[PDB]
Amino acid sequence: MENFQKVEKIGEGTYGVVYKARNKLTGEVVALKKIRLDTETEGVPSTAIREISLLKELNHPNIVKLLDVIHTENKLYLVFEFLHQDLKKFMDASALTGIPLPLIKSYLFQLLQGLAFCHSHRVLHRDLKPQNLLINTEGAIKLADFGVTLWYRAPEILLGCKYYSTAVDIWSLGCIFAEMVTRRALFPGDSEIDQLFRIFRTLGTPDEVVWPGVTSMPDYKPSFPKWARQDFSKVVPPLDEDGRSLLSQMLHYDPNKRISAKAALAHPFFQDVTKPVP
Numbered sequence: 001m002e003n004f005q006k007v008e009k010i011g012e013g014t015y016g017v018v019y020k021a022r023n024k025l026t027g028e029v030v031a032l033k034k035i036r037l038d039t040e041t042e043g044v045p046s047t048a049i050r051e052i053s054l055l056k057e058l059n060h061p062n063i064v065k066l067l068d069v070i071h072t073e074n075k076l077y078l079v080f081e082f083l084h085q086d087l088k089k090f091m092d093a094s095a096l097t098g099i100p101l102p103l104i105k106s107y108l109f110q111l112l113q114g115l116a117f118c119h120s121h122r123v124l125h126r127d128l129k130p131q132n133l134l135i136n137t138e139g140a141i142k143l144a145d146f147g148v149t150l151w152y153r154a155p156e157i158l159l160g161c162k163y164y165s166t167a168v169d170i171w172s173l174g175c176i177f178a179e180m181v182t183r184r185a186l187f188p189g190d191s192e193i194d195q196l197f198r199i200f201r202t203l204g205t206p207d208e209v210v211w212p213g214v215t216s217m218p219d220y221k222p223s224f225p226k227w228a229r230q231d232f233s234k235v236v237p238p239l240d241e242d243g244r245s246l247l248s249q250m251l252h253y254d255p256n257k258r259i260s261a262k263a264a265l266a267h268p269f270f271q272d273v274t275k276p277v278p
Ligand SMILES: OCC#Cc1c[nH]c2c(Cl)ccc(Cl)c12
Pocket: 037, 041, 042, 043, 045, 048, 049, 052, 053, 069, 071, 076
């Protein structure tokens, strides 16, 4: 578009490419997401418009602002507020020493605030990963790029549940929390079955006892191997008992037992929370 000048590519996803760009009218630097629209959604755009309006109405300090939506030339441009660094690049830059624990806890706390807000406005992220968590110099972190890495995918999605809940975001955020702490991805699966089996090898193969209804799920197989659960003390050292307890609740198999963002905000782990400068 004539009012935007591309500075550089900053992201790529399934639906489009993301550029740092300058808005010639406001002088502001923005993230520009370009989506090529199929003729099917152009013919029946009502659901797409409803979902994008829900994203646009989100106003929260821990959510990347959707500034403008431009429909032109069989394309949709989403104009977002711009931030300079993502958590994946920050984790990488911090890999010799670790992100300090007060900063891990501040980031976790703020993302839970963002998710509690999304979730109470019937918005799910669906694809949380370090690369779509954006950070600034003031110690803020923000959810971006609302819904190929499988590492953060909730087990109910991998088991073919079509009608999944807000609990999928809590699972992804739990995986990210473990990763900040240990400096290793929790479940680095390279296929859906390897993803599933990595979760099973750590948390135990789920059954009807721990996850009522699991054996009736679309992609559940009786022939899944049966692994015993490991202790969290070997999974996320040196996280303290408050952190381990919180993580265990974020990684409950049953989506209905998994902690909500709002209840996680109240966990004793956040008793000493502060907002450090990275
Ligand atoms: O938010 C204003 C708007 C709009 C749209 C017009 N056509 C669309 C298609 Cl095909 C997809 C998604 C959107 Cl938001 C629009």
